[model samples]
Target: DDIAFYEERLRAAMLTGDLKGLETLLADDLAFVDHTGCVKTKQTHLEPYRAGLLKLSRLDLSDAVVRAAGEDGRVVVVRAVTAGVYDGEAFTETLRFTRIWRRTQGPAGWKLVAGHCSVIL
Candidate 1:
């Protein structure tokens, strides 16, 4: 339930390029693997959007399956279809992502320590 709220907030922040919101949600040691096979650090992941170099015109998420994992269920795995336009590049793809949201001292109460996303087919 809380994880679902976090997921929606994350999606909105990403699409709107909300640096402040993202900073509150991502851990300092966050590791994220994007769709292009590039592994990025927290800073790298937010740099493009922070610099106004990246923009997502549309991001539709569907078929989301969220499950608990890790000790005490602190980890969450989400598999869904993300159809969107990334800085004018349009595509629809299934993205299975795992997020380790741990307790943090931020407003969100949880931060994404690690995440990975891959395209389906």
Candidate 2:
């Protein structure tokens, strides 16, 4: 259920480039890696969206593995393969992604504190 919530929101954000949704889900100090080994921070990730340079026509996730961690199971590591198109390019690559989500107080929901992605070559 936890994984589903995160994945659903993330997929929506990616497909539509929703900066507001992305910002809410992503942590201030997010670390994301592209297939080319380029590192990107939260702001860097959102920059393309803000400039309307990033677009995803299709996004498909499979082979997901979610595991609990830390006290109270507040932290989790999710591994999955994402095949999608970005910026008008057909991208079908296997990417291993791990995201650590922190549960906050009240109804603000979970915040992704850290994320790392690598191409599974």
Candidate 3:
């Protein structure tokens, strides 16, 4: 249930371009692999949103699978299919995303430590 909640929050933040909220959900050591097969650091990943270069008008998420990483329930992974617009573009290729969330010290609680996505072709 927590995973579902956080996953939706993640989706909502991206769709709404909530820079602060999104950054809050991401860890300082975040490592993200974008659709371009390039790895992005935390700052690099947020730059597009901060610069207004990436705007998402449509965000649909489904087929999510959640997995636990350890006995403490501090870490989990949410893998889902996400489709959306990027920079007003139709984003023809749907993506399957794998994001690892860990319960941390912040008030927001869960932070994304690692993320990777691939084209659903």
Candidate 4:
């Protein structure tokens, strides 16, 4: 489904820092809400790593559920625990995230349109 496709795309982008692929895969009106209640645009979400301002020292994705929204659309729900140093501060957190995806009709493939993430308390 689109959820699996988009999730893999996001993972690939995250691992490789491929902004060109990310740019094409993200919708123009994309929105990302981070775990700390910060709202960010596509560029804002991707820029931290792109510029090496953010680093992922370790990451592990655990439970995940994918839901289909409609034709060419889907949502992914993931539960992940990650330990990393962000801007030099160490953090280990469990997070729940949701990602929305939509695809173009002419074989353009699934693309991410929105994402929301929050820390588990």
Q: How should the candidates be ordered by TM-score, best one leading? A: 4, 3, 1, 2
Best by TM-score: 4
- Each model's lDDT comes to 0.74, 0.69, 0.75, 0.77
TM-score of structure candidate 3: 0.83
Give lDDT tens digits, candidate 4, residues 30-85: 99999888989987887877777666655667688887777777888888677656
Worst 10 residues of 3 by lDDT: 71-80
What's the number of clashes in each of the models? 0, 0, 0, 0
Cα deviation of 30, candidate 2, in Å: 1.4
Off by over 4 Å in 4: none
Q: In terms of TM-score, how similar is model 1 to the real structure?
A: 0.77
Error of 3 at 72 (Å): 4.8
Error of 2 at 90 (Å): 5.1
Kindly provide the TM-score of model 2 when superposed on the true structure, using C-alpha atoms: 0.76
Q: What lDDT, from 0 to 1, does candidate 2 have?
A: 0.69
Stretches of candidate 3 exceeding 4 Å from the true structure: 72-90, 106-108
RMSD of each: 2.8, 2.8, 2.6, 1.9
List of clashing residue pairs for candidate 2: none
lDDT per residue for candidate 1 within 13-85, as digits (tens), equals 9878789999978889998988887999999989878877677656566666655665324666666655555
Which pairs clash inside model 1?
none
Tens digits of per-residue lDDT, candidate 2, 1-93, equal: 365686679879877888999998887977776656787898987887887766666556666666676532344444445544456566666
